[PDB]
Assembly symmetry: D3
Homo-oligomer: 241 residues x 6
């Protein structure tokens, strides 16, 4: 093991320079199974890694877990092993009424409601996605025929108060986030999730390419509590290889 957390050596990657990075370890095998020669690499904490082949070239699929801190460990240690391009696939809650459950979202940049991004760049720095990655993700969605939305995502360190949920133990949301959902909605923000700000900032400020795609699992204008994207991200990876 060349790294402290992932349990991987540089030789494990077989010259791979691109990684797909889901949140849930459960999803890693399913993503790799859509490519050639899939083999299990390692599994430690919420970091499950698999190696696959796409058009003759080595590809990594590795999970991040929930949150920026966990994400920052996986990205850093993957970068040490040779990864220069990261493609993020996740799940999300829509906050705009016209976006339906089943729709696919591509993130251009993130509202930094996290702490981990500040460990790489000050708040004035933008949490922006790589242009080539974003293009590839939009072209892939277009070829597959998925109903897709491009724009800004709010990336939060919490599931509950930072996304202004009141259905909680305290039923309370601190001053900073009181009335914040209505504010993001007016600013044209598409959705909430919990990892992109960290991923995007840390890659953009360190010479690493990153992209972000996600499937909608809930619409917050209706409820607080609740496939194509998987095909989109692997198709995008083919154009970036």
């Amino acid at each position: 093991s060349d790294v402290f957390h992932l349990g991987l050596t540089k030789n494990d990657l077989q010259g791979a320079q691109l990684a797909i990075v889901p949140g849930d370890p459960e999803r890693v095998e399913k993503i790799a199974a859509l490519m050639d020669k899939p083999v299990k690499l390692a599994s430690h904490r919420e970091f499950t890694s698999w190696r696959a082949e796409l058009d003759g070239k080595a590809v990594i699929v590795c999970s991040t877990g929930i949150g920026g801190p966990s994400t920052s460990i996986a990205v850093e240690e993957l970068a040490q092993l040779g990864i220069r391009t990261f493609l993020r696939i996740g799940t999300t809650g829509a906050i705009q009424p016209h976006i339906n459950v089943g729709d696919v979202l591509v993130t251009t940049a993130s509202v930094r409601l996290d702490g981990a991004s500040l460990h790489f760049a000050p708040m004035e720095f933008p949490a922006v996605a790589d242009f080539a990655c974003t293009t590839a993700l939009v072209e892939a969605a277009k070829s597959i025929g998925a109903t897709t939305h491009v724009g800004v995502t709010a990336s939060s360190d919490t599931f509950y108060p930072g996304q202004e949920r009141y259905d909680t133990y305290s039923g309370r949301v601190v001053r900073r986030f009181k009335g914040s959902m209505e504010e993001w909605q007016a600013m044209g923000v598409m959705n909430y999730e919990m990892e992109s700000a960290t991923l995007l900032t840390m890659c953009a400020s360190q010479g690493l390419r990153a992209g972000m795609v996600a499937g909608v699992i809930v619409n917050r204008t209706q409820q607080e509590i609740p496939s194509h994207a998987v095909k989109i991200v692997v198709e995008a990876a083919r154009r970036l290889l």
Copy 2:
């Protein structure tokens, strides 16, 4: 007439939905002359406005002057008159050694070293360009065959201390900005300019499409102070967005 600064009516625009927004009033007519049926509309302070036609469709060219404050006035008042798409063309000082004078840069997002962006969105909101605008801009630069870099820009409220210039009256730089250039360079930042953070934040937070393009006029790794394809690029990009 309809607006306080620009001196324009909705009728002056004749249906225009897109605007090209340079900084210098003197470049406004030059950009308009590259398109069909160029007509001068008005001229007040920083704001010189022209109407032209591109593929039979009305287009506005309006100057912003230097800085986010005056840019925010032009953008706001054009939006009241019906503009929904804004394209900035400017000039810039590169901070990466591999970028030469005359190269073209396309901004995906800006480092917010301004004050006016905060009047539209809190600091954690990204100063990000619209994707369709950026695509057109990158595809236009490639069609004309320009040497092109795509990435992040540092957008500063000042020409001197905020860009870490020491050849000044005082010769000093405040704590915040001392050592900041080396820091931006290490973070992959391409260039310094003075307007993008304001333009990009106020558009992305109000449902307005915005893109940013600039020609390199100086490189900071050698000196503090010093037809371009940039103008051809912005006009070709505007064509694709109408």
Copy 3:
């Protein structure tokens, strides 16, 4: 030619160490006309410069444009050329009920609602006027007999959201400035403006003397925008010329 934006040399100034700095370029020559031996120096972007003579002493008149960014270029490059004392003349929106259109407002210090002032001093540092410049402006106003108000000014990086104007495209104001005008009013702030915070912070933190004066064109307790007119206020112009005289 000695500077990058203003297109001037030290020779153009002919020994000048005081400059009057209006916002609008079209005001430069009109201000210069009230003084002896006026001549046009240069004009680039929003920097229009004229030289005049007051009691046999060389004085510069140079525009700044709208906003602190272009103000900071003008003030810096003028300082490089030899200017050590700056007097700003502008227009303003009053936020107190008793202040009338055409009243003259002299600023002691400014609420830093700008970004450029942070490029010279951290937010703790006061955006304060020079005492000698303020004295000259106050004493000059009394000599003219204008209705004068002295106090704090809020200096915003925007005309619209930062001055809590709602009649806009979005009709929306961000959390920070929502309810802000009522708060400044209660705190005794006289007016809204867009350049003083940058100017005063620049000069005070770099050993330069600065004064700030402006004439009211709208009262924000009744309307956001002044009514349009056709006919072609000047009190503040006389006051700023007379104040310079007392400073030379």
Copy 4:
């Protein structure tokens, strides 16, 4: 299931009001084994939960995973199910010369270098542990005879830059965290971890009781990476004094 992530009902807890919350899911079984009638409950994402008994009273053991965001999810959802007292156990890197590998550290409060704590309370509010919980941990430690240090912890959203590690892909650290380890060291800060700031802030501002204990895994005065027990006994003994 009564909660969204954990996959637990109120009936699963059997009236439990106290939870031991390790970082690593692997530890859940081991901590539960030291108590009686231990049984598995659920496992979803980084949240593995067990239930046991201590002096005839039900106790929960539930993992949080790495970081404040994940910690905040577990703590909130356990609170909805009835948990009022939280005792965290983790691993940590020491930054004081007089603190060695294998020593046990009890946190009174944390330096807030996270983002999740701000979602509960503004920065001025202290990430402070409950006094009853801290007392139980200190006293449990002295009865086992472990080398114990009591004080402030640095709680970071990152393992690398925020803890000022330079053996990285970029080799640089951002302005804010550059020269920061030396500063914390002069301030009397004991150690580095990643979850206590979030945990202590969200409990102290919501009427919940919380304590924090960890074992020293690396000394940062001599090395960045560790490689080149007592705490588990202490946390179980502390919980026993809290029921």
Copy 5:
């Protein structure tokens, strides 16, 4: 003769003392020193009055701070130079919780930092936390005396009026930051308001000094009955007996 700029004390004055009790009021010093053996006045300059007394045969200092973090920081710093390593603050306070009664005793584990002087020792993310041994001694000493005691968080404010959301003032207005603040602190479980615990606890914790904080509740801001002078000084005395008794266990 003085070893320090403000306090007017020497190391000889201390007689080898390593603990100090640090109240706010100059006039309270003599009264607290009256609960110990053989008290003698040492000095009195500005708001800083100092006395020495014996406790179980050990030298102890009692020295006032004045109101606020700035004057507290001067006193604590200059005492530390003279050789003091442990500081125990006794105060009076206003409770903001309905279940906390006038006459109750409050021990602070840590403080909400609404001061400016703590920032001169550590940035805002550092906790304004009490020393464990000092808090242990205070909680246990409270049981010896028999007080009704609450242990938790305290809001430490640089002002008595607007920072404690008081509206009965000259202006009658409260700045944006503090408008609605009392209600929010109440929800977060904050017990009370005072004016110096944030400075003291931050400056000691970040400099290798031990500090503790105890106070008696003189008023509650949720109820309408305001106690008289006699009942208030009865509460103060009750909390004063706890700080001396806690000091015994810290020698």
Copy 6:
């Protein structure tokens, strides 16, 4: 016996007074009032010693503030509750500019807000600015007295040691924020360090009260760290005479 909770004064005690001189040292209060007509001791509670005097037939207050903004804010507010509308501060200070001598007098136009109490009245972007009429009277009073006077910006700190970048302390340690800070204020033309002006100036300017600040230099920090009726106390009395 008292209309206010800290000072121990009634509105009646002020006898119509609308101006107060507000020094820092309680012991110094009596000596200032002794320079005026019919001085009478009023009260003494905590760090607040108050005396009443007369100047050209008008009642004036001299009241002690104690050290620091918090203590200052209590005095100003309760004095305001009893009718005082004009405050004049007289203090001692440490100069940080080479050209300023020990014994010189400094009039403050505005302060660097290195405090916490000012934020309880106005956000940080609000200027800690003195009243123009008060500053004028102080500047003119200096001429009449005949002292060497400098007018400008003052750094107003919540501490005496770390915030004034002093290293001769127990820890010998200065926090990141204030590391190298004295050299920075110096280059920004800041005259001096004190501990009360930011709170005083901000709270008065944002509440419709008039305030002024004068001080005598007791030490120069470019030569020395620790220091060791004056001109400044004469100037504050003369200024008060001009503002009645």
